[PDB]
Chain A
C-alpha cells in the first residue's frame, strides 16, 4: 500500500520473500560455476536458514530482524497468537450497522424499551430510510435520497419514526460475561447523545452510570428480528440460566422508596381511622390529612386462585398502614395481602416478584415489576432521604470501652516484662482483647442506632425502630451492609500487613472522626492489596472462561429420552456442621433414573422418568424423603450429544 511520501508501506512478509529469493538466486548462480564446496555448503546452509525464517521465525533461535530491531512476522506467527487470523478475523470480526455511546438512566421507560439518540438512529437506520423515502416518491434516485437525508428535512423525522415502530436493536456491553450481556430492545427516539437504559436491566448488564459505554447493533433480515423479539428481548429474559433466581430484582433507589412506604410508625398524622378501601388511602395521603405510614384499618378485596385456576373475591378488614394500602393498588389479582404487609426490604421484594412468576405467569410479572419501579421512584423522591454528618451516631460508651481495652494491654505489657508471658502468647492475647473490644463497640453502636424514642398517643414513651437515614439504607438492603456502618461509627478494627500478619494496634478511629497520619498509612495496606488483586484477577478469570467454552462448545441436546437407567446418587451435603445444601435444591428440576422407594417396602413415591418441580418437591419435603436417585448428563448414553431428559429442566 502506498503511504504519504516517496516511502512505501511493505509488510514483514515481503522482506522474507526477497531474502529467500535472493539466496536462491545466489546459490543457483554459484553452483553452476563449479565453485568450491567450502562456499557451496555455507550458501546452502544460509538458504536453509532463510527458508526457516520465512516459514516460522524465532523457533530455532535469534530471529532475524529489520531496521526496527524487532522480530519480523512470518507465516506461522501470522496465524498463531491473539493477533493471528483465527482469534482476530474469524472468531470475532468487526460489523456494520453498529454504534457505541455512553449510557445514562431513564426511569420513564418500560422494560422492553431503550432510548436511542436521534443522530445515532438516523446513522444506523440509513438503508431502511432510503427504501421508504423512494417508496413514497419523495426522492426518485438514490442520490436524491442521500442528499435529502443529510440536509435533515422534516419529513425524514416522520419516516424515521415510522421505521422504528417494532424494529429491535441489540444492546451490548463489553465484557459480555454471560448471555444476558446482549439484550434486544425496542428503541425510542430521544434527543441528546447518550443511550438511555432501563434501570431494572442494569443488574443483568452489570453496568453503572459512571462513564460506561455500550454498543448497539441492528438486525436486518426478518428471521433476525423475529429471533431478537422471541429470544433476546428483555421481557423474555427474567431468570438466570445459572439458577432460578430472577434478574429483574429492584435495587438501591427503588428498595429505599418501597421500604419507606411500607414501614409503620407508632404515632403519626391521622392514626386509627377506618378507610373504605385502598383508593381512599391515596386521597388522604395526597390531601395531607394522613401521614404516609399511619396504622389504620382498611377494607381490601383480595383474589385467590385456590379454585381450579379461577379467581374468587374475598373481602375483609385488615389492620395495616396507608403506605401498604397505597402499594396494594398495583399488585396483580392473584397475590395475597400477606405479601405487602411487611417492611419489604430488598430480599422480600424480590421474593414478591418471584411469587407472581409462580402464580400469574410472565405478563403480569413484568407489568408488576414496572409498577414497582415507578412507585418506588416516586415515593423515594417524596421521602427526601438524605445523609448528613449528624446521621452517623457515635456510641457514647465507645471511648470508655476503648480505655478499658487499653488497660488490658497495659497489664500484658507489664506481665510480658516479668517473664510470665512470652512474645507469641502476648501477641495472641492482645489480638484477642482488641477483637473482643471491637465486637463490643460494634454491638453497642448497633443497639444505639437501631432504636429511637417517641411519645405515643397516650403520652407515654414508647420505643420503635429508628428512622435514621443511614440505618434505613443499611437495613432495607438498598446499599451498604453491617461492615460499612460499623466502619462509619464504630472502630475500623484490626488491619493486616501486606504479608498477612495482623497489626497489634488497631485503628480505633471511625471515618466520622479524623484518622491521624499513622492510622491512615496502615489502612492503605489492605486497599492496595485489594486493588492489585482486582486488577490481576480479571486476566486470570476470563482466560478460564475461554478454556471452559472451547472444551464444551459442541454439546447440544439432540434426543428426547435416551432410555437409560444409569444415574448418580444425589444426597444433601453435610460437612460435620449444618447442612450446606438441602436435598430439595440438589434435586429440583431433574428426573429420576428409577422409581423412588418409600421407606415402607414396595411403595412407589415417585414414578420413574418424571420431572420433579416445586409442587413435587413440597410433597417430597412433607413426606421427609431421605435420598432421591436422578439422572445426569455424565451418565447419558446418547452419542455425540445429551438427551433432553438426562439434562433435566431449562432454568432460564
Chain B
C-alpha cells in the first residue's frame, strides 16, 4: 500500500527484520506532560486542580471565616503565537478561579452559615505550550528540559570501606522526602548507631527513637529477642532450641537428661544441633559464669525497700543474682545479643544515651536543630511535631510512599504522605539487618531509583509555592476579621503567583534557550534528560559514577549521545521508544514471548521489573510464526549477557532502533563505527546549517520522515482534499466531501513563514511542495521547511568524494574542495541578523530620529529617506547608517551596521509608544499591514460568500427555479425570490439570516483588527520608540570554513581548487572533495567508507535512469528497470510493485530519481557488503568500488586505484568569517585601562600566565616587557609608543603599569600599608 505523497520518491529500504511498533510521536514527552497540568481532573490528582485542593479551603485563626475552592477556567490568549513573537510578549492565558468566602457566626455553634459570596479572581497568567511543545516567553522560544533526580523514598548505601583506614564498610540509610527535611541513620567505625537530620550534627540513634514516647524495656523488647531464666533447685535454667545455638561456642558442656550432648571447650557442632532438634529438649542446666556476659532486659526492684535493684541495659553479677533470688523473682529476661546473627548495636547505643527522660532528648534535638536558644518545652514539642509529622512541612507524595513500601517488602502502595512510628522502626530494623549480613545495599545509578520530572510537575510545584505565599498573605489579612466589609477580590493578589511563574519560566537552569538551526536540533533539545538544575547535581560535585553508563540504560537513555567537555553523562538524551511511567520512571516496549512463540502484544516494562524476566535480543532470527530458528539465543537477565534456552525467554525487543536516540539513529552504518566517533558524529549532525537548496541524503535510515514531520517545520494538512490554490506564501485546500463537519464546511488555509529569523541567526523558510489541482490526504506534507526535501530531513549535500592524499592540502584533517562546488552555490547559506535602535528620553533634550545628520556626505544619506529609516531592500554595507539617531548637545548616535558583514534590509519593524507622533516610515508600514489585513479579510469573506451562494443556488434550483434563470439573476435577488415550497422558503430565509449575521461578523472583525493594530504598544518605561532592522547575509564556503560528515570526520577546508586540477576518472568527471585516507585507520570510523561505496552504487542507478530519460525511451523499458532495482536485496522487508502505478506516476517517479535513487539503511539492521556489491553490479561500476583516476594537473594516471563515491557532507555552524579577528588600537577598559575583550567590543587577545611562562622559558625579557607595559596598560607608555612608530622609531619606555597601582590602592584601602621605596 502506498499513498500519493510518497509515490513521488520511494526510498529503497534495506532491512530484514519486520517492524512491529511504529515510532511514536517524538514530542509526547512534553505534550503529554503539560496536558496534565492544565486539564480538568475531577479526581483532583494532576496539576492545577490538585494544587488548589492541596491548599484550599482556608480557615481563619479565630475559625469564624473560611474560603472554599469551587472550580477554575483558562481564558483566551490576548495575542497569538506569531503576534507574540513579533510584538515580544508572552503567549499566555489568564487564570480565573471561583472562590467562595463564608463567614461563621461567632456566637453560634460550628456550621452556622452567615453569608455566601461567589466571585471570580484573576489569579495570574499561565504561559501556554505551543503546538510544537515549546514556550514563547519574551519574543523568544524556550524549551524546558526534563530533569532526572532521585526518587523520594528510603535508600540504603555503603561507603565501600574508603572513609576509614581499616577498610571497614559503614552502611547507612537515607529517607529522601519529596518536600521537607532529610533523615539519615549511619554507623561509625566503633559500630555505634547514629542519627542526623538535614546533614546536621551527629547524634546517637536512640535519642530520636525515645522521642516517640518509648520506655527502655519496650525498646529492648522491640529490638531484641528475650531469653527466659527460671530459678530451679541450686541453679537457674533456660529453655533451649537449636536455632538459638547456630554459630556459637559452648562455654560449658551442653548436656541434658544425664547424657553428654555437646563437647566441652571447643566450638559448637551441627550434628549435635540436629541431635538437639530431634530430641526436642528445652530446659537445660546452666553454670554461673555463663551469665556474666548477659545483659538484663527489664527493670527489677524490691517490693519491700521499694528501691531500684537492676535497671534496663545493665551488666549483672552474682550480687544481683542473689538479690533477685532472695526476692522470689523466678523469671528473668535477658537479650539474645549474638555477635554473628543479632548484633548488639542497640544495647551499646542505649549505653551512650545521655538521658532517658525524653525531655532532655527533645532539648538535645532542639539544640541540634538551631544553636543558642532557650529550650522551652512548647517550642521543642512544636518543632518535633512539625519536623516530620506535619503535612504542611513534610510530604512523601505517592511515588515516595510507593518506593518506601516496596523497599521494605510491604504489600500496599498507598498511605499517608508523612512518616510514622512503624516507618522509622522498620527502617532501623532493615539497616541493622543489612549491617548483620542479611540483605543488600541499593545502587544510586540504577534507573529504578531515578525518575523523570517533566515540565508539568515543575510548573505545578512553582504554582503551589506561589499559592502558599498567597495563602500566608490571605491568612494574615483574614486575621483582621470583619463583618462582610471585604469582597473576595482585594484579599487575593496575583502579583506573587505571577512573579513566581514568570521567573521560573524565564530565568531558570532548565528553561533553556531553544536552538533551532535545523529540525534535528529542535527535536533533540525537546527530548533531553538533564541531571542538573534545582534539586540535582552540579558540574563540580559529580564524580565518575553518575557520569558512567549503567546496564539499565538499554532502551531508555541513549549511550552514545551526550555532550563532551564539562558535563558528559549528565545531559544524556532520551531514547526513541522510551516513554514515562505513571510515577515518572522510564519504561520500554517489549514483545511478550509465549510458549516459545513471539507475539505482538507490547508490554511496557520499567527498569526494576526488567530484572525478574529474561529478555531476548532485538536482532534474533525467527520464522514466520515467531518460533526461534535456533534452540540457543542471546539474552540478558540482570544486567548480564549469556546464552539461554529457547524456553527460558520471556520477552523480546521490538526493533533494533530501540537502544539509540534519534540523532544517533539518523547515522547510517552506525554499527561499523567506534563509539567516540559515533558520539562526535551525532553531536556535529546536531549542528548542521540549512543550505540554500535542500538535497536528499542518498544513504539514509528511514527516520528522516519521522524527524521532519514530528518537528514543527513542515506544514501538514489537517484534512484531505485537493489543492485549489498554491502560492509561495499560502496553500488553500478544498476539503474532500467525506471530511466536512455538518456545519461550516469551508476550506483550509495554510500561511507559510518566509525568511523569518531563527534563534541562531539562521533563516527559516518554507516552500510549497505540491502542484495545482493535486489530491492530498491527512498527514501529508504540503510545504517543506528548512533542511527538508519533500517531507524528509536533509541537513547537507552529497558530494563526489575521493580518499587519497593530494600534495599535502589535506594533511591532518583538512578538506580540498573544487571550485565547481562554489560555483553552483551548493553550500551557500542565508543568515539573518537583527539590529535594534531604541529611542530613549535622556537629559538635555530627547533623542530624535531624522535625516539631519552633520559631518556626513550625501552618499551616506542617499540610502536613507527623509524619515531616516533605511529603505527595504537597500544593499547596505559596513559602516553605513540604518536609523539616523542624534542626541542633543548635537552629537551623532546613529545606529550603524557593524563592520565585516554586508547586508540587504528585508524587514523593518517599528514600535512607537502610545500618544507619540509617528514618523513617515511608521505610517507607510502601518498602511502596509492594514492593507494586508483588508486583503485577508476580503479573501475570507469572498470564499465564505462563494460557499453560501453555492448553497443558495443548490437550494433554489431544487425548489423549482431553473438553473439558467437563477444564474442570469443577480446574487442578491436570489434570497428575495419567493418559493412555493415552505421548507425551501424557510431554508432561504435561514440562509438570508446567515447572510446578514455573516456580514455583521466580518464588519465587527474588521473593526476589531483595525482597533488592535492601530492601538499603541506596551514596553519598557523610558523609551520613546523602538525600531528593528533585519539584514540578510549570503554566506559562501571559503578556506577556513568547517565541514563534517555524519560519522564524526570533521575538517576545515584548506584550499578552493580549480576544476581543471581535480582528479578525473576515465569519463572526465572531476571529483568534488578529496579526503585523507589516513583518518580512517586511527579513528576506526569504517562507516564513512561503506557509505561512500553505497552512495557510489546508489548514484549509478540514478544515472542510468537519467540516460533512459535523455533517450526518451518508452515506459515499458523504464518500468522494467525501476522494478529490477527495487526488487534487489536478500530477504528485503519492503515490497514495491509498479503494477499499481499509472504511467504518469511511473514517469514522475523516474523524474524524481534522476539525481540518484535513495537508499534506506536501518541502524543495526543495515545492508551488508554483499548487497552493496549486488547493487554495484546492477549498474556499470566495478564491484571493488575503486576506480582509476588521473591527475588533473599532469594528466598522468595514479599508480593505484582510489576509492571514489558519493558521501553526505554537512556545513557546521563554525564559519571562519565569524572567527577572524584583529586589533591594533581600540577602546580600553575603565578601571584597569586594559584593552577590552571579545570580537563584539573590538578587543585584544588575552596574553595569559601560561604564555608568560612560555616567554620566560626563552631568554625573552624585552618582549615580555612590551606585552606587559606598552601594549596592555601603561597609559603614559603606549601613547608615546604609538607616536614613536609613526615617527619611524622602534623603541619603548618601561613606564609603570596602571594595573598594579590600582592593586596598591586596593590593598591600601584596607588597614594594610604597602608602598614603594627610594631610588
Contact = CB atoms under 8 A, between A and B. Distances in A.
B1234 interface: yes
Given A104-B1040, A382-B1199, A549 B1164 contact: no
A175 B1250 contact: yes
B1223 A102 contact: no
Contacts of A232: 1258, 1260
A227 B1260 contact: yes
Contacts of B547: 528, 532
B859 interface: no
B151 to A, nearest CB: 22
Interface string A486-523: 01100000000010000111000001111111101111
A498 B552 CA distance: 13
Contacts, number: 448
A5 B1022 contact: yes
A535 interface: yes
A75 B808 contact: no
A107 B1198 contact: no
B1013 interface: no
A165 interface: no
Given A227-B1259, A382-B1198, A192 B675 contact: no
A101 B1285 CA distance: 25
Interface string B51-80: 000000000000000000000000000000
B565 interface: yes
Which one of A78, A105, A123 has the greatest number of beta carbons of chain B within 10 Å? A105
Interface residues of B, number: 153
A378 B1199 CA distance: 13
A511 B1303 contact: no
B592 interface: no
Contacts of A616: none
B1078 A532 contact: no
Contact of A211 (B634, B670, B1050, B1285): B1050
B878 to A, nearest CB: 11
B217 to A, nearest CB: 44
B1306 A96 contact: no
Contacts of B554: 521
Interface stretch (B167-175, B713-721, B1083-1091): B1083-1091
Contact of A524 (B549, B1077, B1185, B1299): B549
Contacts of B1263: 170, 219, 224, 227-228
B1185 A473 contact: no
Nearest to A134: B1286
Contact of A119 (B1222, B1252, B1256): B1222
Given A176-B1251, A221-B1262, A104 B619 contact: no
Contact of B1040 (A193, A202, A231): A193
A369 interface: no
Interface string A78-110: 110000011101111111111111101111000
A201 to B, nearest CB: 12
A474 B1081 contact: yes
Contact of A102 (B1082, B1220, B1286): B1220
Interface stretch (A333-341, A417-425, A477-485, A600-608): A477-485
Contact of A387 (B1184, B1203, B1225, B1249): B1203
Interface in A213-235: 213, 215, 217, 219-225, 227-228, 231-232
Given A182-B1254, A210-B1052, A532-B544, A387 B1081 contact: yes
A127 interface: yes
Interface stretch (A250-258, A309-317, A624-632): A250-258
A117 interface: yes
Contact of B568 (A192, A209, A531): A531
Which one of A175, A390, A530 has the greatest number of beta carbons of chain B within 10 Å? A390
Given A208-B813, A231-B1258, A384 B1281 contact: no
B1201 A386 contact: yes
Contacts of A512: 672, 1086
Interface residues of A, number: 140
B1052 A94 contact: no
Contacts of A381: 804-808
Nearest to A191: B1039
A112 B470 CA distance: 73
B642 interface: yes
Which one of B1080, B1081, B1237, B1247 has the greatest number of beta carbons of chain A within 10 Å? B1081
A385 B1200 contact: yes
A99 B1221 contact: yes
B569 A532 contact: yes
Interface in B1209-1266: 1214, 1216-1217, 1219-1226, 1230, 1232, 1234-1237, 1243-1263, 1266
A126 interface: yes
A120 interface: yes
Given A527-B675, A529-B548, A104 B1054 contact: yes
Interface string B384-423: 0000000000000000000000000000000000000000
B1203 A220 contact: no
Contacts of B1258: 179, 227, 231-232
Contact of B1052 (A87, A102, A221, A532): A102
Nearest to A87: B1249
Contact of A75 (B1090, B1281, B1309): B1309
B803 A176 contact: no
A415 to B, nearest CB: 16
B568 A528 contact: yes
B1081 A192 contact: no
Contacts of B562: 528
A318 B1306 CA distance: 78
B1186 A210 contact: no
A85 B1302 contact: yes
B438 interface: no
Contacts of A222: 1290-1291
A82 to B, nearest CB: 11
Contact of A5 (B548, B840, B1245, B1282): B840
B1169 interface: yes
B804 A227 contact: no
A598 B1172 CA distance: 73
A93 B1022 CA distance: 38
Given A102-B1220, A487-B1084, A521-B554, A179 B675 contact: no
A126 B1288 CA distance: 13
Which one of A6, A387, A549 has the greatest number of beta carbons of chain B within 10 Å? A387
Given A79-B1306, A389-B1185, A514 B1198 contact: no
A20 interface: no
A252 B1078 contact: yes
B1052 to A, nearest CB: 5
A484 to B, nearest CB: 6
Closest 9 CB pairs of A and B: A107-B808, A384-B1198, A194-B1040, A99-B1222, A179-B1257, A527-B675, A123-B1222, A377-B808, A92-B1248
Given A5-B1020, A256-B805, A532-B568, 15 more contacts: A85-B1299, A94-B1243, A98-B1247, A104-B814, A176-B1254, A210-B1052, A221-B1266, A382-B1191, A383-B1199, A385-B805, A389-B1093, A389-B1185, A390-B1186, A512-B672, A513-B1168
25 contacts: A91-B1252, A93-B1247, A99-B1220, A174-B1251, A176-B1253, A176-B1254, A181-B1254, A199-B808, A199-B811, A217-B1245, A219-B1266, A221-B1291, A224-B1262, A384-B1201, A387-B803, A387-B1203, A389-B1090, A474-B1081, A488-B1081, A505-B642, A512-B1086, A514-B672, A516-B671, A528-B547, A532-B548
Interface of A: 1, 4-6, 55, 75-76, 78-79, 85-87, 89-102, 104-107, 117, 119-120, 123-128, 130-131, 134-135, 142, 170, 172, 174-179, 181-182, 192-194, 199, 202, 208-211, 213, 215, 217, 219-225, 227-228, 231-232, 241, 252-254, 256-257, 292, 373, 377-378, 380-390, 392, 469-470, 473-474, 478-480, 484-485, 487-488, 498, 503-505, 511-518, 520-533, 535-536, 549, 553
